[model samples]
Target: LGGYMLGSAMSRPIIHFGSDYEDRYYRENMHRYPNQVYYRPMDEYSNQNNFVHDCVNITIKQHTVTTTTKGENFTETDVKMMERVVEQMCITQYEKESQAYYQR
Candidate 1:
């Protein structure tokens, strides 16, 4: 029951992919590609998962889950809406998760 998205690429991978470098880079939105993440209940409050899926990578952080396929096929120019949703969900979902289990 998740909406799927899309994209295309053949360049060097950016970010650490599994380290703090990737996390810090995202703070500045350095990854110039469609991005995506889910709600990771695995790690503590550091709920961000770093991995590539389709066009976007899974930076599974906390809050709410942006259950959509970021790489639903929009190679370029038409993913603005996707970007907007991601930016919003990143925080929207993040807020709840931070507060809900932050004290844990």
Candidate 2:
């Protein structure tokens, strides 16, 4: 089996029954808390995902700086800093994925 199988197996849901009291309560109220699921293949790779992840990180860092600066607008220095951070993040991810593909 590949990493995908391993990932899926790990995420599979299990029904657990506690003592009679707990089981009864859960059985009565289980419908109130429906399961919410998300799926992603373990070995999947996408440039879009990479870009979005990097952008999210950039936004978080930008937020931190903005908070520290007391809601000031981004200056030229801030723009350049963010640009450099984005460039470095993308280049690092490209290198990492390229190495993984090459090795495989």
Candidate 3:
């Protein structure tokens, strides 16, 4: 017997190093990922040392499993849909201030 819902959780959203040269996602694949992507802006921060700190870019952790052709049908929309989600996370990602603060 054959089934259409064979899909399962395989890949992950991942922690992008933000480095120009970094390793690739091992589970990244055409079949498993079908390119239904994720999104998210980054937040910045600073300590009392007058230095800036970089935060990780927000990401949509890959949720594998789609029946009857994968993705689409409004729920899987990543552009504008997840776009806001990314922005939301980015807004609160770093509640701290950026570029340090001057003495009062």
Candidate 4:
């Protein structure tokens, strides 16, 4: 019950969009050339967890970047750029996940 609530929260459209994008990218890429790209096969539960993990990872990275640069030194543009960087990083994580799965 509690898990379902947490999963539901994590599985929102905003969170899953990147996951779905990576999934689609991986599928298309792999179909064209086998083993050229990789991504995990994520069901609802795993997708939710993957999204949360990426969010957490990127938040940590954001904090580190902000702290190192100082809040005042980092402009709004820098923050916006960082947001895009995090978005790409999240998508890239799916590839890592796929690689990990293949290794196992």
Better of 1 and 4 by lDDT: 4
Model 4, total clashes: 0
The local distance difference test score of model 4 is 0.40
lDDT (CA) per prediction: 0.38, 0.41, 0.30, 0.40
lDDT of 2 by residue, 19-101 (tens): 67644644564432212211223243455555435443454354446556876554554444444444444444445545586
Model 3 steric clash total:
0
The reply for model 1, stretches above 4 Å from the true place, is: 1-37, 42-56, 59-72
Candidate RMSDs in order: 12.4, 17.3, 15.2, 14.3
TM-score for each prediction?
0.33, 0.32, 0.25, 0.33
* lDDT tens digits, residue span 44-86, model 4: 4354346645454445454555467754344444344334444
Better of 1 and 3 by TM-score: 1
lDDT of 1: 0.38
Model 3 deviation from the true structure expressed as Cα RMSD, one decimal place: 15.2
C-alpha-based local distance difference test score of model 3: 0.30
What clash pairs does model 3 have? none
- Model 4 TM-score? 0.33
Give candidate 3 misplaced runs (Cα > 4 Å): 1-58, 61-76, 97-104
Error of 4 at 63 (Å): 3.8
